Amino acid sequence: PSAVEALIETIDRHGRVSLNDEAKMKKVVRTWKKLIERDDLIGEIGKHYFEAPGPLHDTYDEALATRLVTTYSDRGVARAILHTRPSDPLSKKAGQAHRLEEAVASLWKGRGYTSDNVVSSIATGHDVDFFAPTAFTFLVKCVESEDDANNAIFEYFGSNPSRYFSAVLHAMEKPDADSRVLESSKKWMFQCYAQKQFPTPVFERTLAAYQSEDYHYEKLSLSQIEELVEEYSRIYS
Amino acid sequence: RIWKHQVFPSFHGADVRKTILSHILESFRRKGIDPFIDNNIERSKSIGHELKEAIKGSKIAIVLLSKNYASSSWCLDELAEIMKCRELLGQIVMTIFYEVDPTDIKKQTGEFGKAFTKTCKGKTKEYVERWRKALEDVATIAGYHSHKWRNEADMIEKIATDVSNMLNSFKPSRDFNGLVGMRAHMDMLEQLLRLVLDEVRMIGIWGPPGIGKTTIARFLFNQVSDRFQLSAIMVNIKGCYPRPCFDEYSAQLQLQNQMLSQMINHKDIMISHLGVAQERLRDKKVFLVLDEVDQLGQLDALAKETRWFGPGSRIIITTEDLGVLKAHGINHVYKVGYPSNDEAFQIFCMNAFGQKQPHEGFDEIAREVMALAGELPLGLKVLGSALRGKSKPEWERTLPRLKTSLDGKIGSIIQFSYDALCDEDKYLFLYIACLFNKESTTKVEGLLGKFLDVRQGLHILAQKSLISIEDGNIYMHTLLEQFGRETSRKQFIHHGYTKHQLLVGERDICEVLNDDTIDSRRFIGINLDLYKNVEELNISEKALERIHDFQFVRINGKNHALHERLQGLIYQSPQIRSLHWKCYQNICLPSTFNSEFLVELDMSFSKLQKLWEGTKQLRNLKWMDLSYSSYLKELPNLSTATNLEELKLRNCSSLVELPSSIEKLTSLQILDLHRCSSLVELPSFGNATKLEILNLENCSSLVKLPPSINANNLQELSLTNCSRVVELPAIENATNLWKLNLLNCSSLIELPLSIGTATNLKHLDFRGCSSLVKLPSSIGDMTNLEVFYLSNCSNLVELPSSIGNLRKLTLLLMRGCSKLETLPTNINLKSLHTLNLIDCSRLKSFPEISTHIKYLRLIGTAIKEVPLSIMSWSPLAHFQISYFESLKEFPHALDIITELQLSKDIQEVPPWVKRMSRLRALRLNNCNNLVSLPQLPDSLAYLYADNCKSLERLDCCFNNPEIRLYFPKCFKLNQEARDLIMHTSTRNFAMLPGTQVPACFNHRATSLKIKLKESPLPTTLTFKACIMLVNEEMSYDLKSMSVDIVIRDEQNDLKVQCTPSYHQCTEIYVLTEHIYTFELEVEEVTSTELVFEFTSVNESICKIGECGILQR
Amino acid sequence: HQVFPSFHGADVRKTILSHILESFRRKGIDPFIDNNIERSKSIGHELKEAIKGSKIAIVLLSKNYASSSWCLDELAEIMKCRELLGQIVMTIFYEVDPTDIKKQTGEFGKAFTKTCKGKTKEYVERWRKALEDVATIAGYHSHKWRNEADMIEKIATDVSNMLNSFKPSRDFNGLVGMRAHMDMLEQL
Amino acid sequence: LRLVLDEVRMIGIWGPPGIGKTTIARFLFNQVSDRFQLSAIMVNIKGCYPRPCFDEYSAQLQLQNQMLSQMINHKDIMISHLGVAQERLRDKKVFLVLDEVDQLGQLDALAKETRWFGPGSRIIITTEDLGVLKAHGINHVYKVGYPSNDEAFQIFCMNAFGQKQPHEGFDEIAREVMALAGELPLGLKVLGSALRGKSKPEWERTLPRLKTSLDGKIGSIIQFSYDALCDEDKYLFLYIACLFNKESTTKVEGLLGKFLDVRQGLHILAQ
Ligand SMILES: Nc1ncnc2c1ncn2[C@@H]1O[C@H](COP(=O)(O)OP(=O)(O)OP(=O)(O)O)[C@@H](O)[C@H]1O
Ligand SMILES: Nc1ncnc2c1ncn2[C@@H]1O[C@H](COP(=O)(O)OP(=O)(O)OP(=O)(O)O)[C@@H](O)[C@H]1O
Ligand SMILES: Nc1ncnc2c1ncn2[C@@H]1O[C@H](COP(=O)(O)OP(=O)(O)O)[C@@H](O)[C@H]1O
Ligand SMILES: Nc1ncnc2c1ncn2[C@@H]1O[C@H](COP(=O)(O)OP(=O)(O)O)[C@@H](O)[C@H]1O
């Protein structure tokens, strides 16, 4: 059979059989790669599922995205988007991946997910993964504002500044980490405490109280704690 | 037990030793059987005693019976010993009645009976008694009869087959049990084989060294060779063939001699001329396998033409160079592929831990080692064997050794294939392994063009399966690249009369720069990776004095550190051909940096501001890639950059303006500004520029634009967000506009008329493009325009009448166009699928384009009318109208409608809705003032009511199909109505406002476990399930939910099936205090104990709280 | 065909001939096949045509070989082709002395005499001449060999060796200009 | 050994090159093979193996073929597949001696499972690195020890004074030369043969140059064993032979820890 026929049959089978969680978590990636293999499928399969019986959609991409979410869990689609980002932004595969992820983001917005719902869906268990660009940009698209994205990720840490700073410092040590964006998140956290007008040593103890054992991530060390205290000290005196 | 011999034959020498016994022995030697041969009894030993000893150490005794078997006392004594041995020890005895019948044996009469009487005249009584008893009991054994077989050869073949089988010789190989996943190979290769086509088809197998071509050939031979008259396998032809090949003809003759000697069972042939194989195999079905064919001489020697072989013959040649196959005209080629990651892990585990799964605690380190091994089966086997009997700390501290040094077993095998290359191919291989591992083929051709013929070299390397080109980027396998890097130190590179070497190392290759004793001119390439420490690398001050001619630089300086010494060392180079520096971590390129020779410049992350601070000679520059250099403000004069091809200022958010010197960029084809939050303008480009990809995605401050583009070849043009863009540049032709979109590009006023000139723009969006007043009249010009999105494009009070010329668009989404008032009338779009006009708050007329529309959506409009022409329209799979009062006047509209949507405020309860036949859905948007509901029509699937103040009675008896009754917030419901909602036989969800599970569902609980009993003997059972949700910070409008169901037992563990094993809805409201009901069927006949488990996929969205179900 | 086998079915078709057929089959040798339903009192034209194009023949001789006018005619045609054409004839003396074949004596001679009654003079003359000639040629005496299977294997090996040497240098005649070298070298 | 237990126990023998692994194996095979129904000895498997071994399966097949031909005395037949050894020998008493096994490939060739030999049999493989034995899972290992000083003198005088287990004549320089030879039977034999037939004064001129440089006979074997190492292992070997010959492992790790990954190097060298 042609590529389209086989891909439709496979998607229908996977949505039909209701198989294991990790089996879906794996097969979603293979399906995703088969999608962006050539440029003229997302439109075509979107057209096919558009005309199939079911709820109506405003576009082909919405139909394809809805089918992918039905076939593989919100957890599987987010993981596939994160794990299947090509290198060259101007290549055909990059365009196909952008179409898919934008369709999924619009689909989530149409269902009225909160920021927390999106964060929990992207969540992988390693608190630094949220600051990888391939995930942070998708989060920003899903929430439309970096301030809200930072607030959501901060609250997913239980409003723990220590865990947040640990994650951002670990993200500072990535080969492709965007310094501007990570710095923007750090500056956001600084400004959030500046709105509290907390004293510099009071700020230090606000940070270091979570350094206690109140709550499985990697905690800070006193050195960069004092560094952050110094950073906050004069900027918003 | 222990036996010295497998088979001991018993017979009479004078009769069968010459004629038949010989043939049986010859057959046995050909089946891997070692029978005892009395001729091999050592001299100077007692024959009787030795023979008796040999009898008892034999697993099988074969007794050949002749008419004079009784003549010899040796035969009788050995037979008696055989029978005592079988009855006492247990050796197996088979009989062959060669020209003799068992009946006369036990009588001892006539044939063989005369002989027994003659031989028993002089003896004792006990000898005669033992012989007679043994003779009778052996005549009892069922064996083989000579007279029952038409030819002696078949009988001997059957006897040998029986003996070999009953020996449990295990002829199938157990070696082919430790190999993983060759079913895929065999299935893919059967299709190429097609052994029922009786041609002489030739088949090739090629792939990188170590994927398993030899093993695949061996397995295929074992599976298939039995179906051909003659079969032959030749292994490692490349190895045996002479390397210089001083005398080709003699080597070819010897090779064909080997092939013939192993194909024909002729043990030692001496071939006189290369034509013997053609002469001998003309009319025979032949299966021939040739492994590692290196060059065409071997093929000519072994199989030159298909005419050499008879009908149905197959030959399979495995190689690494595709050119050999093509030159011989094969065209039936199986390119072997890498195994799956799971299969790779299975192979690695088999070689390391001896089983398909790792021992406990080894998983992470095992996977690290695997990932180091790339994907080659050879690499996996080598690493697994190297780490077999080790312990976990040894694994952890030997992994770094594995990374730094490539194992010798892999290295030699790769070296052999590397040596066969030409000199220029070797140099290109080293270049690819060292610097340009994953780069555009065009960029490699540009950089290395003058040194060597890059195009032909890449083609040859791909033919050799040493590299792979996927999408214009070359790819070298990890092990192969690692081998390439090591040879860089041990091998030199000669281009003309000079000599060069490369420098590739993480950080350890820098002290060679401090050698200060060797000529550093022979260093044209650097590949450094500094993701180790922020500490400055150590170089002698004297090494800083020497100036180096570095042509290719690739530094991945991933840290916050600044490398003053490295900068001083490199930017002192006179001519630098290409320069890549990731994470430059400086402010400006130093002034002493000469750039006359500079073809490619790449800085993917930088802190540069105003680099070069002055005009320079960018004479031959062809690629600028400044990406993510967020701390960048300006850019130098690009005059005298006429050869520049592509410019990627990717995501540099601080670049305030672009220089007017971009006019001098005549050959520029790519301008990339995906995120430039600080631009203001974009200066005019020129006349011969011919941009190909203009990508300005989110330039949220870009105001002005060029007035024209001369876009003769403009594949794409993207301005997605660009919120403040007033005008738009004109276009000349755009005969190839493969993509154009303006999604949310508000503040636009018009569109350039020449947009109509794009004759191939199949798709087109203006979604969110507010403030756009009027579409251009030239819109009808585009052909093949299939999709046309508009959404909330307010202030678009028109639609051009030229649209009828489009003739191909399938869907026209026009949502929220809250000022569209008219629509072109005299038009028939011969292929139009849908038409979305939702919330077009002033559309005010019926959309009259007499078409083949299948999906019409007019909700929130102001139509208030339906024409009579609609009966011309044959199908309508969907047709949705926001209800108004005077629908009663249009009976022709009632039988065609499909949906309906009552407004905010409608007192009336419309009875006549029962008349309309097809009414698939019915929606009550808010209905804050409603009371009851009439009898609904018979064909419903959907029914909604979001936040209505009263639906006290729902007097509808409706029994169509899977019907979804959603009632988000309506608490004034009669208990009869509420029960109807629950007690309706659907196949979909049903949701209602409730605070706790109704008592109708007896079997209750709170991933949760539902336990209940049953009252039935043997039947299919039907269950109704009710579910609430966990009280959480759920969104006011969550609109999708899916539920999975698992049912098990506690007496058995049989996972019973459940036909509606999931319920999914993409429109159901998800809210806290509500009741969700559905139906299940179970068919297996476990009697008393069922345990249910309802889970909510997307646990991060919705979690099942209380629950309870009920039988029926 | 590859090889033409001549034999007397009643004597050897069951016991030894099957082994030789199997050995030839395993050595890639395809002898001409015949059926007992495919024989008349005479030999027929197609049988002679098969004989003439066989380019090698194997005459397996048994005690009652001479007791079939069919077999005698086959042998006469085989010798005729040997003398005129370049046919190569191999003989197997299955427990019969070559001298007995030569002088037409023993049990073989008795069977030959009993078969010769009624035939015309020239038939008897051709039969006797062919018998003498086939007795002269060097073959394989079954009595000499201690091991029947070894003798059959040796026969198969010799057949294979004397079958992959018919066409002399038929291949690689596509080499150019050798006549000039041959002429210039003949003078030397 | 414990032959009486009729199992398929495999036994290793390992030690520095030049102790007598080959000679011990030969002596044992000479003494015991008569008690076994079928037996064979393979000598210098390491030397008789293709160094690049481009097709390790062909070489493995021919190694098994050599084993079978030597063992059954079966006129060096050709072997079809790799499982034939099991098919033949899984039902007979077997005494197999594999000498100088270098890597796991040869072991997979010749004896991969104890189920290949059957009701009572012994396979004895002599190696130099414990890692090969450990990977195959043997755990019945005899670490050959140096002979006693008196036995060392007997060997040296056997190889120097012509079959005289004691000295002849002087008996003074002999012990100096012995102490120079350490304790390796290889070293004792080489030094004894070097001074064979000399007179006491010739002995005295030979002593100094013998002391300041070792014979090429010992050097070749030691060099071959040395070349089979990783570069880090070679560097650690040189460090130990030069400076830290007799030092605590902890101090060696503390001083050389920045360079060589001392723990792994010591583990490999000890193996
Ligand atoms: N001690 C001996 N040395 C050499 N040859 C011997 C000896 N004894 C007998 N033979 C040979 O054996 C031949 C007789 O073999 P015979 O037919 O008796 O074998 P057999 O009894 O059928 O053997 P088996 O009982 O093992 O089947 C004699 O021709 C003789 O040459
Ligand atoms: N055509 C033949 N093919 C095979 N064997 C033959 C043939 N003719 C004769 N023999 C063998 O030769 C044997 C008789 O040999 P004979 O004693 O005649 O040798 P000879 O004539 O004395 O030899 P020479 O003439 O060289 O002295 C017979 O036993 C027979 O088996
Ligand atoms: N499917 C497989 N399962 C297990 N081992 C394999 C498989 N394929 C290859 N190997 C191993 O990889 C090694 C190299 O394979 P080989 O066939 O020699 O490669 P090549 O095709 O270069 O000759 C072999 O020793 C073989 O045991
Ligand atoms: N116990 C001994 N008595 C006498 N000579 C010995 C003894 N052990 C070893 N040798 C001699 O020392 C040399 C050491 O060789 P050997 O250690 O057997 O080689 P390998 O190191 O391969 O085992 C041999 O030539 C042998 O003759």
GROMACS .gro file of N, CA and C in nm, chain C residues 41 69 73 115-124 127:
model
   42
 1390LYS      N    1   1.104  -5.429  -2.942
 1390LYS     CA    2   1.202  -5.531  -2.978
 1390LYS      C    3   1.322  -5.468  -3.048
 1418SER      N    4   1.854  -5.859  -2.774
 1418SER     CA    5   1.884  -5.798  -2.903
 1418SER      C    6   1.879  -5.646  -2.895
 1422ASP      N    7   2.199  -5.430  -3.010
 1422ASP     CA    8   2.188  -5.322  -3.107
 1422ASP      C    9   2.239  -5.191  -3.050
 1464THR      N   10   2.086  -6.601  -2.813
 1464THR     CA   11   2.024  -6.483  -2.873
 1464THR      C   12   2.049  -6.477  -3.024
 1465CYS      N   13   2.155  -6.541  -3.072
 1465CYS     CA   14   2.195  -6.527  -3.211
 1465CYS      C   15   2.117  -6.618  -3.306
 1466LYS      N   16   2.032  -6.706  -3.256
 1466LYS     CA   17   1.956  -6.795  -3.343
 1466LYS      C   18   1.845  -6.717  -3.412
 1467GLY      N   19   1.839  -6.725  -3.545
 1467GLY     CA   20   1.735  -6.663  -3.624
 1467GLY      C   21   1.778  -6.536  -3.694
 1468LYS      N   22   1.874  -6.464  -3.637
 1468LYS     CA   23   1.920  -6.340  -3.698
 1468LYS      C   24   1.996  -6.368  -3.827
 1469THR      N   25   1.998  -6.267  -3.914
 1469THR     CA   26   2.074  -6.276  -4.038
 1469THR      C   27   2.223  -6.269  -4.008
 1470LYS      N   28   2.304  -6.299  -4.109
 1470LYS     CA   29   2.448  -6.312  -4.088
 1470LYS      C   30   2.511  -6.179  -4.047
 1471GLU      N   31   2.469  -6.069  -4.110
 1471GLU     CA   32   2.532  -5.941  -4.082
 1471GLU      C   33   2.502  -5.892  -3.941
 1472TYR      N   34   2.383  -5.922  -3.888
 1472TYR     CA   35   2.355  -5.887  -3.749
 1472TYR      C   36   2.451  -5.958  -3.654
 1473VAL      N   37   2.470  -6.088  -3.674
 1473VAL     CA   38   2.562  -6.164  -3.590
 1473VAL      C   39   2.704  -6.110  -3.604
 1476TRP      N   40   2.734  -5.779  -3.421
 1476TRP     CA   41   2.732  -5.804  -3.278
 1476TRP      C   42   2.866  -5.857  -3.229
   0.00000   0.00000   0.00000
